[PDB]
RNA sequence: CCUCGA
DNA sequence: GTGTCAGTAGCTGTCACGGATGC
DNA sequence: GCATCCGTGAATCGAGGGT
């Protein structure tokens, strides 16, 4: 039970606040070890 | 650097092109580096000179 | 002074004009992706910069160095990177979505376990929640119950049994 | 009018009616109205949701 | 610039419509074009009108018209965007993988750029890619050509996942697939009753 | 996305 | 480190309809 | 002020096979 769902423009700072953290690297993982990279796409 | 979300400029009728009162084309060359635009102007030195 | 710094930004403009569309069509054959074709532009006139020497002689075709260092910069990408993941696209046809399986054997099996962890004593039943459930070292549970290291290991090794007295007499396969 | 109601936008016949019953009451001018038809798929693109 | 850079400030790109929309008076605005849908020539006066809707929004809602520039790109979670194994050993991975990855790669070199001083044309002519790559990863195709990927195939963007019949609410919400249930050849049954 | 069934 | 020409494939064999975009 | 051109839409479920 939830009564109404509010839809608006995301600020720069409501897109900081969501993200855990900035994507820096371009790197997505290692072939290798399966490993995602550090400050990847899928950095943990 | 700022970027523009192309669902605010392309889609029509485009909001930005309604808001700024700008045309959609000449929108278009502004975002994409084919154009300068004016941010600001100071008239009253340029009156005084 | 301020103007030479701007005859190097105005000469920079130039080789553009003249090299940059045709560097672009060169990577796009060489690669296909037009994206990349401008990543390799970009890539390539940056090196020019950062060489006086090519910038330098104007009656030697700069061209010439232009589409070697191109070629160059698309085999690297052509490496180990792209090897193994360039293959598939899970938005493209042809490749399996992945699945889960369903909890029915692990639901069945935690209501077996919670039938017979009532049928245990306060003290074994909340030793063998500490051990398993909690995840817990010995020392760490008979800190917390304010027991012996010994007695911790002794109602565990009880309570296994105990447990395993009660599933054996529903018929839980060993 | 008194509305908020911007000129030109298609509202439903019930909170027109019970918009103009608060100005009304309120001393300022009631929105006007004209029955206008939209069809079924504009219409519903129009709904609240 | 050169000869009256001191009376005016000119820019280029995005940057300048966020600065455009800064020095903008959205109420004042606003009630320019109510006084010219009060009094007015239906053909310039449904122009304002439509403007009139969109401006207005702004006004009551509270909201900034800056949000629709960005300087911050959200990244989507990595479970919504699988990267998948063959049985061969090579990889699948999902077309917006490619898509925020092409983002970042020119992102980083903005940074570069910047750092390293490059001539104004390469800084300029960057950031320009930038705002065709962060145009893609939203709706890719919107503008101009799609971006191909292997065998001229124009990527999936982050809007479509949402239309027509494979999109999110048609395909996944409207209708899901459901456990207990089943299909089979039918047969008819004459002794059958109707119930 | 190839072929096919109501 | 790089240095004589050195330059997509593919493709239009859909259409009705509305309204912002543009001369 | 109007012709152009842009973007939106185009039935439901189901089987099997390749990359």
Redesign the pocket.
């Known amino acids: 039970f939830f009564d109404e769902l509010r839809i608006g423009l995301a600020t720069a700072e409501d897109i900081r606040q969501w993200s855990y953290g900035e994507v820096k690297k371009p790197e997505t993982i290692n072939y290798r070890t399966l490993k995602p990279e550090k400050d990847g796409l899928f950095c943990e | 650097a700022p970027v523009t979300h192309i669902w605010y400029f392309?889609?029509?009728?485009?909001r930005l092109?309604?808001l700024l009162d700008l045309?959609?084309?000449?929108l278009?060359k502004i975002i994409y580096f084919a154009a300068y635009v004016i941010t600001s102007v100071d008239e009253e030195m340029r009156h005084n000179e | 002074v301020s103007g030479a710094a701007a005859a190097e930004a105005a000469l920079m403009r130039a080789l553009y004009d003249e090299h940059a569309?045709?560097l672009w069509?060169?990577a796009?054959?060489l690669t296909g992706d037009?994206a990349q074709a401008e990543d390799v532009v970009q890539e390539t006139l940056l090196?020019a910069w950062q060489?006086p020497?090519?910038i330098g002689?104007t009656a030697?075709?700069?061209?010439?160095?232009l589409?070697?260092?191109a070629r160059?910069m698309i085999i690297?990408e052509r490496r180990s990177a792209r090897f193994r993941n360039v293959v598939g696209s899970t938005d493209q046809?042809?490749?399996?979505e992945q699945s889960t399986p369903d909890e029915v054997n692990a639901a069945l099996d935690r209501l077996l376990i919670a039938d017979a962890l009532a049928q245990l004593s306060a003290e074994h039943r909340a030793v063998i929640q500490r051990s398993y459930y909690r995840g817990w070292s010995t020392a760490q549970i008979a800190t917390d119950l304010g027991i012996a290291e010994g007695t911790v290991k002794s109602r565990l090794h009880y309570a296994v049994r105990a447990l395993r007295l009660t599933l054996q007499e529903l018929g839980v396969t060993r | 009018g008194s509305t908020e109601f911007l000129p030109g936008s298609l509202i439903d016949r019930a909170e027109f009616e019970a918009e103009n019953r608060r100005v009304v009451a309120e001393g300022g001018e009631p929105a006007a109205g004209r029955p206008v038809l939209m069809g079924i798929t504009k219409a519903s693109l129009a709904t609240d949701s | 610039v050169d000869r009256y850079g001191e009376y005016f400030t000119g820019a280029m790109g995005a940057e300048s419509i966020q600065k455009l929309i800064e020095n903008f008076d959205i109420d004042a605005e606003a009630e320019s074009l109510r006084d010219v849908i009060r009094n007015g020539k239906g053909?310039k006066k449904?122009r304002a009108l439509?403007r009139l809707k969109v401006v207005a929004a702004f006004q009551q809602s509270g909201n900034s018209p800056m949000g629709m520039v960005l300087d911050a790109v959200p990244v989507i979670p990595p479970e919504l965007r699988p990267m998948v194994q063959l049985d061969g050993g090579r990889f699948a991975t999902s077309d917006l993988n490619d898509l925020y990855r092409r983002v970042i790669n020119r992102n980083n070199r903005l940074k570069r750029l910047i750092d390293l001083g490059a001539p104004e044309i390469i800084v300029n002519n960057e950031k320009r890619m930038l705002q065709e790559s962060v145009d893609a990863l939203f709706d890719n195709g919107?503008?101009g050509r799609p971006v191909?990927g292997p065998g001229?195939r124009p990527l999936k963007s982050l809007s479509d996942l949402l239309?027509?019949?494979q999109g999110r609410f048609?395909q996944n919400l409207l209708?899901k697939?459901v456990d207990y249930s089943g299909?089979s050849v039918i047969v008819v049954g004459p002794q059958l009753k109707l119930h």
Do not use: C, I, M
């Not at chain 3, 046809?93 to 399996?96: A, I, K, R, V």
């Open positions: 392309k889609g029509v009728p485009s092109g309604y045309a959609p084309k000449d278009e | 569309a045709v069509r060169y796009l054959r037009a090196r060489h020497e090519v002689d030697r075709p700069a061209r010439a160095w589409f070697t260092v160059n690297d046809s042809g490749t399996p | 053909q449904l439509k919107r503008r191909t001229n239309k027509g019949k048609r209708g697939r299909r």
